[PDB]
Amino acid sequence: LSPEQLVLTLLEAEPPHVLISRPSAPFTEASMMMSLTKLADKELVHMISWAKKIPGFVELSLFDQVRLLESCWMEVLMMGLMWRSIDHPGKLIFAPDLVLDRDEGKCVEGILEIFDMLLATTSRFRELKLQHKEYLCVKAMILLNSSSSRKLAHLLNAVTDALVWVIAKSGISSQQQSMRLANLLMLLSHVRHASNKGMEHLLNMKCKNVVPVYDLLLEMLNA
């Protein structure tokens, strides 16, 4: 399985576009958290299937598959959010029927913090002109690097090898192939940071029972 074919299978693992079935209208704190949690829950279902489509993932121990997903899920969601928002500066495209503005993030205490973080990282990927295939490798690495053991490192290395390949196809300088690789990877730190904050904020919302009970989301949030 060459880098190109591995990237192809990631493309084929891409989850489908999700909508929350919500008639267009202004947002409030009760409806925003409602939509954000409802969307996350649905995306979580598609994320599980996506992972299983990653060559070798289902070959890992059951203990590993669970710990990998339980720890990276929010990062993967936010990485998807950023790729969808890339061509819409100043906007967070959570879903076709859930587009948010920075000022709208003021309807919820503490979320404006997280939006700015997301908008910044997104803007960054925009400056770098993140390509789809890079997005596929990066997202895959987030799952595999958010820690049967050898199989994992083997898989992680394969995806890493796929990212380099994608960068090599752009036909840019070698020095620039290295600069780009590092800049794309250094951003994972910001996605992991906006993630930890998003979890903290979400966990806090749960403890207050301000958001409906989403079995899958609840389970992933607790551990």
């Binding site: 279902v45 599980i48 299937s49 299983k52 289902v58 059951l62 669970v66 079995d215 899958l216 389970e219």
Partner: peptide, 9 residues
């Protein structure tokens, strides 16, 4: 939930 989806298609 997470485990059953990991063991079914």
């Amino acid at each position: 939930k997470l485990v059953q989806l990991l063991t079914t298609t």
